Amino acid sequence: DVPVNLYRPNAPFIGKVISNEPLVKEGGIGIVQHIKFDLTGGNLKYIEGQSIGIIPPGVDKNGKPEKLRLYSIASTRHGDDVDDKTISLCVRQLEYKHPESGETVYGVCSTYLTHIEPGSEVKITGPVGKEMLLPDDPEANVIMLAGGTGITPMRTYLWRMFKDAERAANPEYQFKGFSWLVFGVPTTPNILYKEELEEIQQKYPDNFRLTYAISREQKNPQGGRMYIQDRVAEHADQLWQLIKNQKTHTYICGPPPMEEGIDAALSAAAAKEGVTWSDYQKDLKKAGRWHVETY
Numbered sequence: 001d002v003p004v005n006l007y008r009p010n011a012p013f014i015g016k017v018i019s020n021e022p023l024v025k026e027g028g029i030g031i032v033q034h035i036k037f038d039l040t041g042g043n044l045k046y047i048e049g050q051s052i053g054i055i056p057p058g059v060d061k062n063g064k065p066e067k068l069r070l071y072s073i074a075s076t077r078h079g080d081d082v083d084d085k086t087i088s089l090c091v092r093q094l095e096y097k098h099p100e101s102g103e104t105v106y107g108v109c110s111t112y113l114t115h116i117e118p119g120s121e122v123k124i125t126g127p128v129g130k131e132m133l134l135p136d137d138p139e140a141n142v143i144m145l146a147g148g149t150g151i152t153p154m155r156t157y158l159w160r161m162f163k164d165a166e167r168a169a170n171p172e173y174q175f176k177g178f179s180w181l182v183f184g185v186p187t188t189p190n191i192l193y194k195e196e197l198e199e200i201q202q203k204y205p206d207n208f209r210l211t212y213a214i215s216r217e218q219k220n221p222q223g224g225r226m227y228i229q230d231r232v233a234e235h236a237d238q239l240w241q242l243i244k245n246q247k248t249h250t251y252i253c254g255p256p257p258m259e260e261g262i263d264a265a266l267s268a269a270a271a272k273e274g275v276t277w278s279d280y281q282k283d284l285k286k287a288g289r290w291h292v293e294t295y
């Protein structure tokens, strides 16, 4: 059923870049690009929540070919144009400090991708992953906790749930549950897919709630910069109440350090009802209702 590894590193699918557009608006921090690839000529198929590998050209400092880097798929199974002909990615250009051999360091694969030109051929592998799949039940509740590019799998879920063209193409999935996205980024211009996310909330006020944690524009009750963990603590009781439903699924995607604060928040909420979150969570994971993908 679930498509997986239709293409592997030894014989990748050679796709062509259709478009490469900026997602970080003026005044934002960093570079994050939405890149769409043409899948025609191959049989790569995928579903929401999966990832694909990209093999960048060139060799590493040791002279060996570069290995693949995984990227969460940003598009639904049908592609952004709902034509079953493309696949998209949401790629941040990795760049960091000086104390790392030299002065400025740019990630190999992410810099290759963010600067790639339309028409270029790219080596693609996958799809991969069964840990971040969306339930087929249209009545399920879906909690999405995302940091930065962690928004990516969430975009695939939300588009499938709320885009007009998606609903028309998926007669078997007419979402009527409740979805809540808590999205943490440093600035408003850094709110990836902002316009479309807010459009969805305006059209489906009873099925989608959007909450932002904007660090450079908001402060938590302690006076520190606002991060996703702070919003989760602020809404811990509401989130725990939703999590208690047998049909609720939670997805966490973003930096590894985000998990600790989220668990501490939910632990305090669950404790009010005599429940130890760490134990309840273990059962949720075993039931496949607690999905995590951090990097």
Ligand SMILES: Cc1cc2nc3c(=O)[nH]c(=O)nc-3n(C[C@H](O)[C@H](O)[C@H](O)COP(=O)(O)OP(=O)(O)OC[C@H]3O[C@@H](n4cnc5c(N)ncnc54)[C@H](O)[C@@H]3O)c2cc1C
Pocket: 051, 069, 070, 071, 072, 073, 090, 091, 092, 093, 094, 095, 096, 097, 100, 106, 107, 108, 109, 110, 111, 149, 152, 293, 294, 295
């Ligand atoms: C399942 C999964 C999904 C992912 N999804 C996405 C996605 O949707 N979008 C996206 O942009 N990325 C995603 N990533 C990360 C992505 O795979 C690559 O790791 C990322 O693009 C960086 O690779 P690079 O080629 O830029 O860097 P490399 O060239 O491999 O450089 C990385 C290396 O440099 C060092 N390094 C990195 N950051 C720092 C720092 N701050 N300080 C010091 N040293 C550092 C480490 O040694 C690290 O191994 C995902 C990762 C996984 C595992």
